[PDB]
């Protein structure tokens, strides 16, 4: 039998960042498809981007500073290849901003690395970013915070965006994600972002949720959910999850905002890609 996990979404964590969920919701009107890289996995167990297993891989780098560039290698500390994906595993996927990273080392005593991952010297693909100001040596980084970006001018916070991994131009990025239609909308697991701002980021699935189906790798076109309170039992609405990882739901006009996070998605049956869902 599929299963979902039996835990609050509360208690659970965003899988772009190591943030606790405080809330779902819904894309901006001019948001059709998504392209997030962490945080994919199908229901099948399989996993897709830059995706890793535990949330202590998520938004982290590591390399060798040059003092002008840092090479990349894969949280291990192993060699990463361009063949091998947009950017090594658990690499920050935070598109629309600027980043502010925390830097330190294994075997000594910690450094704010800031990135605008615009820049031609940004190239994660090919393993190299540039090293604003940090000094060489190898490094262990883990998003703290982020800020505006600072070059499509006068621009605002965007978590909906990916960033410019490459150019070289095949960076080999997982597929986008497409609401289904017929009146059904993409499900996001929102979270508090520190920064100078009131930055909401969005995540198709909770990083536990990701960890539960790569083990629980159960061998169904869509699956029925209900958004049950634990307490009560009462089923709270009703929700779809798609083969390829992600959730719909039809907004009762202009949706999950309006629903409480205590709750939990229990699985109900496997059920045609076109059944219609009754409005949220």
Known sequence: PFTLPNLPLSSLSNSRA???????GISPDNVQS????NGRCTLDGRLVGTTPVSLSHVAKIRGTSNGTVINLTELDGTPFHPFEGPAPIGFPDLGGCDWHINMTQFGHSQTQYDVDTT???????LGSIQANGIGSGNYVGVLSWISPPSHPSGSQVDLWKIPNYGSTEATH???SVYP???????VFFM????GPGAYNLPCLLPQEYISHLASEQAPGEAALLHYVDPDTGRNLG???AYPDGFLTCVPNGA???????NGVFVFVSWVSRFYQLKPV
Request: negative net charge; without cysteine.
């Open 18 to 24: 190591p943030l606790p969920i405080s809330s779902m």
């Open 34 to 37: 998504v392209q997030f890289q």
């Open 119 to 125: 820049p031609d010297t940004f190239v994660p693909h």
């Open 173 to 175: 990025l997982a597929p």
């Open 180 to 186: 289904p239609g017929f009146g059904e909308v993409l």
């Open 191 to 194: 979270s508090k972002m520190p």
């Open 238 to 240: 009703e929700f779809k």
């Open 255 to 261: 949706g999950p905002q309006q629903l409480p996070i």
